[PDB]
Amino acid sequence: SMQDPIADMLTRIRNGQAANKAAVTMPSSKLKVAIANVLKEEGFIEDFKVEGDTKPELELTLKYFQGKAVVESIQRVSRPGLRIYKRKDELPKVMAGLGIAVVSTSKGVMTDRAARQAGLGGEIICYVA
Amino acid sequence: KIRTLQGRVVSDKMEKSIVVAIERFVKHPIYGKFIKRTTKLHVHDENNECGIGDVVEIRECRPLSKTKSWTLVRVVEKAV
């Protein structure tokens, strides 16, 4: 169901990257926008966008360099059925630090790199490769 | 004030006694799943105060019976 709409968007990317589709449309939210902001910040997606008032729709433009996709893989780590939380140095690094995780800390939604520098962690979302 | 827990009434009238069903969230050591655990504890009461359909604050004390080593202080609202 709509139950887990965070992991929906992670599947929307991988299907869009596999299918070679440019524009991907979906529902919007508070955390839903802030995850996509971190994807553009490091430089994975091309750009994020929102359009609407009563029912805003999250439009994520997908970036492509070669014929192969930009993002290698994106998977839901922490899920409704089982949550994962990481303190300060317990925060795991993906592919020897290459790429970024997405981690929701107290001050805001950050990466595994940025969470180490500030000196505070929280609920990990997903691993961007 | 001394440390407290957020447990609810659960038993109405035990003839000048009151149990407190305490909910809590704990990470399971092996799998890492978060299961709700229920800690039922006997508490001493005064002047037949409010019973079930309420949530009652709790604090440690000298045991006035077998087990029953806690005392109440404050209760949220009235009806369930």
Binding site: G43, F65, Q66, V70, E72, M95, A96, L98 | -
Partner: protein
Amino acid sequence: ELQEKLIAVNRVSKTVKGGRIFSFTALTVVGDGNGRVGFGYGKAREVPAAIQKAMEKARRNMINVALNNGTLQHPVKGVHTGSRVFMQPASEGTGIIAGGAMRAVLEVAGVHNVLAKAYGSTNPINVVRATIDGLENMNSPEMVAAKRGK
């Protein structure tokens, strides 16, 4: 610089109208010592005939694998048919410590450090290619600067 070697040889059977005729197939993997990983299987009625075609086919279909110094850039998962291969970089650690079938592909690629532990099926012909697929899909921190950075 050719640095070529065989993994294993396995006798097979046909069983025609007359009777059983046995062929031979030798798996081989090759490399230049710094990337350029390649392999070949082939078959023949003799042992020295089959190994020749294996080394001959190993020259073509050769692709670059990106390494930091003498180690992997990161840990990478790779699968082929029914085999499942993991690996960890482990910088200058103990090194080239692994069993046959996957021993050849690592040492000739250039790695003198990374740990294997191949799960699932451990068939000599399926355990190879899971490396080359798992090393091809692996990307380089310098040349991923297209997507990375800006």
